[PDB]
């Protein structure tokens, strides 16, 4: 019972983000074809479960060149971070460990 939203257009990730409040926003720029990105989504989709009060997002890159272009994503899966609109923090690489302590660290 997934709380991961999935994004769809530039104008849903501006809103998402909004609608995000005060809260700690992840989001995950992934592809369908991408084997790391299917290796660790249902663990992002977990975290989302664990972490009730921190908001989780996913951007596929195919649907979404434009957020991915504007992100400047260059590899899958990338995880950045948010409040309020704002990056606070980001890494690449489907990374369990590094995922889990940079919420930890920045929720
Ligand atoms: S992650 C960059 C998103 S936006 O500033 O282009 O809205």
């Not at 991961?4 to 909004?18: G, N, P, R, W």
């Not at 995880?79 to 920045?106: C, H, M, P, R, Y």
Request: net charge positive; aromatic share 10%; with cysteine.
């Amino acid at each position: 019972g997934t709380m991961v939203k999935q994004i769809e257009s530039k104008t849903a990730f501006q809103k998402a983000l909004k609608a995000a409040g005060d809260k700690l926003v992840v989001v995950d720029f992934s592809a369908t074809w991408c084997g790391p990105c299917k290796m660790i989504k249902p663990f992002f989709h977990s975290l989302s479960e664990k972490y009730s009060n921190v908001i989780f997002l996913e951007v596929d890159v195919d649907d979404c060149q434009d957020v991915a272009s504007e992100c400047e994503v260059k590899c899958m899966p990338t995880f950045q971070f948010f409040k309020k609109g704002q990056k606070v923090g980001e890494f690449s690489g489907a990374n369990k460990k590094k995922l889990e302590a940079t919420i930890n660290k920045l929720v």
